[PDB]
Amino acid sequence: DSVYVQNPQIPILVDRTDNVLFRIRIPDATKGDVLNRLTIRFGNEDKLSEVKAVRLFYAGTEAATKGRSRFAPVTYVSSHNIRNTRSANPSYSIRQDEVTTVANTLTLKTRQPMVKGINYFWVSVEMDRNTSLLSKLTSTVTEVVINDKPAVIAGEQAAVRRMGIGVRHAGDDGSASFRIPGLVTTNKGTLLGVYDVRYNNSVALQEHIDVGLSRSTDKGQTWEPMRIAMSFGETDGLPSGQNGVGDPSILVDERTNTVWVVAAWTHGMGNARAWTNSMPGMTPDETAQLMMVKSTDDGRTWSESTNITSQVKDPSWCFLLQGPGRGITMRDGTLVFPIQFIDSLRVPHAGIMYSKDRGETWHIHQPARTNTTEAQVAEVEPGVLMLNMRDNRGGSRAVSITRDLGKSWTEHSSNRSALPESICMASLISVKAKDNIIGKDLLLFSNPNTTEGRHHITIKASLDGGVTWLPAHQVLLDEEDGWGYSCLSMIDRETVGIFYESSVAHMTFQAVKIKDLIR
Amino acid sequence: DSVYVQNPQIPILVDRTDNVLFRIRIPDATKGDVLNRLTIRFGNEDKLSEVKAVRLFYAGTEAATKGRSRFAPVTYVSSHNIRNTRSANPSYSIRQDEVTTVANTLTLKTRQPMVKGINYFWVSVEMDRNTSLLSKLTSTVTEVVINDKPAVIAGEQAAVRRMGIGVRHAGDDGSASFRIPGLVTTNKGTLLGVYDVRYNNSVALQEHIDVGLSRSTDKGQTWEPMRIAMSFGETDGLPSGQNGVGDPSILVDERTNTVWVVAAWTHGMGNARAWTNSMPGMTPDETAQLMMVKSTDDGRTWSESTNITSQVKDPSWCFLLQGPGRGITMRDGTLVFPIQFIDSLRVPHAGIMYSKDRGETWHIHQPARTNTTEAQVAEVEPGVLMLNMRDNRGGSRAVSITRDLGKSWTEHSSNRSALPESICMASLISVKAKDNIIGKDLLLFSNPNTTEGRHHITIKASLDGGVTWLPAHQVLLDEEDGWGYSCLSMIDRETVGIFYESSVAHMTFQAVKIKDLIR
């Protein structure tokens, strides 16, 4: 009569058959014990009309050497299995009960005789496909009955669960995986999400990789079928596997609504990683190429690729590429893409690349900091760019300031202190006071909020230009393991959108009210 | 400059679209160089009528960091990709030319401008599906033309190539992988091949694993659809992922033609490895179960499973299971399966389990040797069993003798000396003088012929009861990387069959003339 319940803070996907609502460990069972019924209660203000079904599963027992504090023996719903990312793997979970009309109180039953020791059950919630992304479930296991005696319930299960949508699942359109998210909002309020389409596997360039794009005109409820924003197929009669293009960055020219996508095209390089194999020079045969496409129809169709390598790459650099995620338009109309280069001695540096002429020509000046890679840039005050950098030293984000488009750089007070990381891509955006419901300038940041691994994907807000990130002004979205990359874009005045690699899908979209972030 | 050719000693699969005949490295190319023409010559006695097509592919260049001695940048034809194991991955190889009528001289052409430095081409052979498994190609690249000047050819390319058949490819019947081959010949000359059907991935028990069986009544030219010899589905309401059965061993009762299959059923154990997680006791909830099925109709249908655990397992053992591969009938009608057990202190021991009553009851006496696992047994002389053991000490096979069914054991002269291994399953069989064309007692052995990795799958023959394995009495079948497990069975008086995990398919069958092994 002692049962442990977890309510995991992971997204409930509106497009999934199964989502883990509760994991349950019964640690000290006698052979033949039966979980006769368990009762679930939903908060009074929950929209139960959007809940399609609730299922109780049994997942058997634990291995003798894996200890007694786990809530599962295995991943119940895979985000990697190309054959099934949408329902529980039936080989790990057997359905005991199912309810297809959901009330505020709900009872699930089993007749399953338990084995001696640890026994695992879990509750799946299925949502209607048209469920609001802003909907929230407050669910609690209130009663567990074993051998017709109510059992003592323990565990943190008070989580307020949020909805999301799997824009790209492993295997979609025959692609093994999707990685490296970028997100912008066009002047028409259209969401544009870019990513690597990694056809063969999940390894970085060099490989068969194109830049894909997902488009939504209804704030992420619906996503139009995947467009290929950029591709090099069998250029020069070299295999598509030696013509990959990826690590995309996307920005909206706020003056013209012209959408720009920059990416790294690797030509040759056998089947090895560009990071260690891209070499000095300028030609496609010599070094990775900086390539760009544009859309003048709000991201519906895409220009042929233009090669901008000659404009910005020093010949001595082993590798120049965009910082993955997004770029910005400044108040004065300057277009800015974060960049990174590996110098002649294999030392990586983060910096910025900008256009003054609507993207006709691009310029790079001085690197911001030694041994940095992926970076995102925000205009924190007029003419003042904040670069927020992945740092190979580990532990925390590097933060620098330029007032001269990266001719010179100043360390910010928050440098290597305020924002923990595990050496991973992070998103930073600025929101003007007049452009959001709070009526105050915001910085919004997202990354895996840990110094080890990639998990606890969190949106953080700053009211003081990134000097301070109060714990209260943070929302945890995904406490389980993923590939960690994310990108933020304001959807409207009241909600921020996050397009990220999650524990529940390769490309996950969630929408969060600013009023949830700030007070 | 020179051009390098390799003729890799790997099986040409009769059921494949593409097979690597030649790999070609042009190391010192000038940008724009064109391989105009390449001429292939076949031996005068080759059966070119069963060659369906020959293709020339281009696979681009090499990575800067991967040196200049490789014959490819990547696996051309995958044995793991569930979406395609039968043709070249089109993202790594572009077809230049194709010939569908093959003569003793053959010319392939390209117009492809080469990149500066290393350029890779390769020759694919496609065989008629009804190609004899005993057929051999003797092929050499005799001319390579670059910029209408013949180039200097170098490299070992004098291999005599052999045919094979992919009985099981990764992805077949929705299964991620197939592992752990066993092979017997029934009294009706029927080949029976058993293996793990590993549905979710390629990891060992505990997982969703069944024992599959492939049957051939024409010496391996054709294989009947996969039968499930053994399965535990959702026994006791535990998931199929916690009801795996695998590491199968198969023997023919030569007196009755009754076919027996023994396998390890793991019940519970979360999603962890049975090797470290099976614990002392006797019940399915406590420890791995030794389970058996039989076929009285030459392997067409299979009995329900019988639980043998209580007859032979010491309660203090963490784990008792069959040695994967095959068992034997002795001259006196005793049925013998090799076995292995992990004692109370986690020390593994190889031994034998036998029946004197046509498989009604089974008995285990003493272990042969400390820190041994997988073993195969042959009757080398009347009443004299040779156990050939995987040894955790590394470098070489353990070999012991019993003449009292393992009550007592003697080290053989060949022990830890004569047969190199990398710690891997190996096959051993005996052939009586009156049962084969040579008219002499044979021992035949197969394993990866190396002390490191799993490659150079080789059949070895001994004329002196395993005292000596002369280098001349050996056939190399697969010089490239695989999972290494194999099982031998005589097909008829003239040919040995090998069912093995190869570089070209999860379950590969080849047939070899004894007269190729011996002089």
Ligand SMILES: CC(=O)N[C@@H]1[C@@H]([C@H](O)[C@H](O)CO)O[C@@](O[C@H]2[C@@H](O)[C@@H](CO)O[C@@H](O[C@@H]([C@H](O)[C@@H](O)C=O)[C@H](O)CO)[C@@H]2O)(C(=O)O)C[C@@H]1O
């Ligand atoms: C163009 C490019 O390289 N792509 C990006 C890559 C970058 O290299 C880093 O931003 C800069 O350091 O980062 C990502 O992938 C990383 C990560 O997986 C990391 C840790 O797992 O390993 C890395 O590669 C290692 C490893 O050992 C190698 O075995 C893997 O290939 C090598 O030794 C050199 O770094 C691996 O490249 C990532 O963070 O997710 C994917 C991103 O597209």
Ligand SMILES: CC(=O)N[C@@H]1[C@@H]([C@H](O)[C@H](O)CO)O[C@@](O[C@H]2[C@@H](O)[C@@H](CO)O[C@@H](O[C@@H]([C@H](O)[C@@H](O)C=O)[C@H](O)CO)[C@@H]2O)(C(=O)O)C[C@@H]1O
């Ligand atoms: C359970 C069982 O009966 N399975 C068989 C297994 C046996 O465990 C060994 O004979 C015992 O020594 O052998 C095979 O699997 C091996 C192999 O994959 C090997 C690496 O090539 O790793 C091994 O696992 C390691 C690693 O640590 C573990 O963490 C990985 O799983 C562990 O220490 C056991 O040695 C892994 O068991 C093999 O040789 O191919 C396949 C065969 O089914």
